Every structure is written in structure tokens, then in C-alpha cells.
């Protein structure tokens, strides 16, 4: 019954998921002046040319665009990562107004939304086994600010009418996630967790420094989605973000000088 409301939101999650108070929880605030440049970090290799999207699903918390991860098509490697991580899905977190919505913050700044491209380490064979490992996942996080429209996002925006409520899905083939990337791949990285229950501490976070711009109209359509199922009282899907969590004994590294 976890969600984002007063009675089931982030402040309650620890009761069913005690790791919510663990040692490597996400998201965090990125304090830009103390994130040291690490010249040993490699350029990020984002290889999405062969990505096969399949479907888009409203899961009652966000919407997921799902990919065929049965072969090494769309993969992330390099950067802080050892080996190869396969893209399984992407989703967003966003706010009720433009001044909040992101999960990570940058010098306490909240962006209007945040895109998460979720990948699993192929050395573990399946996603379910990967989430039993401290290096099982790599999530590429990209901030969204409101300004000019993002052309590569419009196909997502236009299908949302068909998945308004929890449990609805639609065929979503031939979507190219390269259209959601900014120009620069400069990033910050740190070890963390899933930002929704079960909050598992599996994730190498890679957060890009450069936001993408989306239009007010694009994010307004996100905010017309529903957390509820069909036939139930309408609860707009907004403010589906977890606030920043204590950094504890971690360092955030920058890929850029
Ligand atoms: C854990 C899984 C459900 N959760 C996620 O896959 C997930 C992915 C990414 C994020 S985020 N917001 O950090 O990018 C959060 C949750 C279920 N599952 C368990 C075994 C298999 C499957
Ligand atoms: Na530091
Ligand atoms: Zn997420």
C-alpha cells in the first residue's frame, strides 16, 4: 500500500521496508562544490542504437517504458561501471508544479522532473538476481527543466491518454531513447538504492550534469495521469518523488573538471 500520499508516502516506507533508513539510500543532494573530479572515471558509453521498446505501463506510481532485455541490445558501460548493464525500462518522477519533481537535487535545487533509465548487470543473468547484488543495477538519471519542447519526448506524451489509470498498458514499439539524452554526458556518480520500495541497495547512480528541456505542455500531460485505477476516485499522478536522503559515508564523484 505504499505510495506518495500523507498516509503512505516516503515518511512511512520504513515500517514495511526498514532499509529505508539504510546506509546507501537514494536520492541524495549533490553538493557540487564538494563532489571531487575523479580523472580515473571513464566516459560513459551509452549504446542505444539497437534498443527495442515494447510497451508502456501505468503501474500506479509512474509509467514505465519497457524494453526487450533478452539480449545485449541497449547497454550502458564505461564510466564508473565494470562490465555491461542492459536497459530494462525507463520512467520519470515529477511534481505538481515546475519548482519540484526531481529526486536528486543539485546544491538543493529541485528540477521539474527526473528521468531514470534502469539497467541491470548482465553478469547476474536476470534482473531478479541482479537486485540481490550491491552492483546489480546502474540507473542513468537525467534532470528535466521546463523551457523548449523535447521532440524525442513527444511520442511518450501522446500515448499517455491511453494509459491514464493504474494497470493500463499500451504497445510502445520503436521508441528511440537516444532522443531523451542531453548533449553532454558529463556526470556525477555515487553508490545508492532504488528510490521506491523495496529500496534495495543495488544501484550505481550516474546523474547527468546537463538537464534536458521539455515544454510546459509536455509536463502538464504527465500531471494528467492518475495514481488510481479505472472507476476509482481520481488522484492525479503528481509529486511521485522521494526527497533527498542522508549521504552518510559516501562520496559523490564528478566525471568532469
Ligand atoms: C524491484 C522491482 C521493482 N522496482 C524496480 O524495478 C525499480 C527500478 C528502478 C527504480 S529507481 N526510481 O530507483 O530508478 C526503483 C524501482 C521488482 N522486482 C523484484 C525482483 C524482480 C523484479
Ligand atoms: Na566529496
Ligand atoms: Zn526512478
Q: 111 near 142, Cβ under 8 Å?
A: no
Q: Which atom of ligand 1 is nearest to the CA of 198?
A: 1
Q: Give the residue numbers spanning the domain of 32.
A: 1-257
233 backbone dihedrals φ, ψ, rounded to 5°: -60, 140
For this PDB entry, the determination method is X-ray
**Does ligand 1 come within 6 angstroms of the Cβ of 118?**
yes
Preceding omega of 27 cis (within 30 degrees of 0): yes
Phi-psi region at 175: left, alpha or beta (left = phi > 0; alpha = psi -120 to 50): beta
C-beta separation of 215 from 48 below 8 A:
no
Residue with the nearest Cα to atom 5 of ligand 1? 194
Q: Atom 7, ligand 1: which residue's CA is nearest?
A: 194
Asked if residue 130 lies in contact with residue 203, where contact means CB atoms within 8 angstroms, the answer is no
195 is in an annotated binding site: yes
Ligand 1 and 116: CB distance under 6 A: yes
Q: Is the CB of 106 under 6 A from ligand 1?
A: no
Nearest CA residue ID for atom 1, ligand 1: 198
Compute the distance between CA of residue 201 and CA of residue 191 in angstroms, rounded to an integer: 8
- 116 assigned ligand-binding residue: yes
How close are the terminal C-alpha atoms of the chain, in Å? 44
Cα-flanking dihedrals φ and ψ of residue 219, to 5°? Answer: -70, -30
Integer-rounded Cα Rg, in Å, for the chain is 17
| Cα–ligand 3 centroid distance for 194 (angstroms) | 7
Q: Which ligand sits closest to the CA of 115?
A: 3
Q: Pick the atom of ligand 1 nearest to 196's CA.
A: 15
Active site residues: 61
Beta strands in 7-73 (DSSP E): 29-30, 36-37, 44-47, 53-58, 63-67
The finding on whether 195 has its CB within 6 A of some atom of ligand 1 is yes
Number of domains the chain is built from: 1
Determine the Cα–Cα distance for residues 13 and 9; give it in Å rounded to an integer.
7
Amino acid at each position: 500500500h505504499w505510495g506518495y500520499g500523507k498516509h503512505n508516502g516516503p515518511e512511512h516506507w520504513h515500517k514495511d521496508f526498514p532499509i529505508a533508513k539504510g546506509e546507501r539510500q537514494s536520492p541524495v543532494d549533490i553538493d557540487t562544490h564538494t563532489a571531487k573530479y575523479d580523472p580515473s572515471l571513464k566516459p560513459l558509453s551509452v549504446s542505444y542504437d539497437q534498443a527495442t521498446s515494447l510497451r508502456i505501463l501505468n503501474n500506479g506510481h509512474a509509467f514505465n517504458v519497457e524494453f526487450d532485455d533478452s539480449q545485449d541490445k541497449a547497454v550502458l558501460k564505461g564510466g564508473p561501471l565494470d562490465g555491461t548493464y542492459r536497459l530494462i525500462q525507463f520512467h520519470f518522477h515529477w511534481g505538481s508544479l515546475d519548482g519540484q519533481g526531481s529526486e536528486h537535487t543539485v546544491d538543493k535545487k529541485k528540477y521539474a522532473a527526473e528521468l531514470h533509465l534502469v539497467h541491470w548487470n548482465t553478469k547476474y543473468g536476470d534482473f531478479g538476481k541482479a537486485v540481490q547484488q550491491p552492483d546489480g543495477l546502474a540507473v542513468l538519471g537525467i534532470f528535466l527543466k521546463v523551457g523548449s519542447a523535447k521532440p524525442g519526448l513527444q511520442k511518450v506524451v501522446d500515448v499517455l491518454d491511453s494509459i491514464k489509470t493504474k494497470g493500463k498498458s499500451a504497445d510502445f514499439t520503436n521508441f528511440d531513447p537516444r532522443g531523451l539524452l542531453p548533449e553532454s554526458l558529463d556526470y556525477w556518480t555515487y553508490p545508492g538504492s532504488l528510490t521506491t520500495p523495496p529500496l534495495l541497495e543495488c544501484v550505481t547512480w550516474i546523474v547527468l550534469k546537463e538537464p534536458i528541456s521539455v515544454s510546459s505542455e509536455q509536463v502538464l500531460k504527465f500531471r494528467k495521469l492518475n495514481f488510481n485505477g479505472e472507476g476509482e476516485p481520481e488522484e492525479l499522478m503528481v509529486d511521485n518523488w522521494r526527497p533527498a536522503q542522508p549521504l552518510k559515508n559516501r562520496q559523490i564523484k564528478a566525471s568532469f573538471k
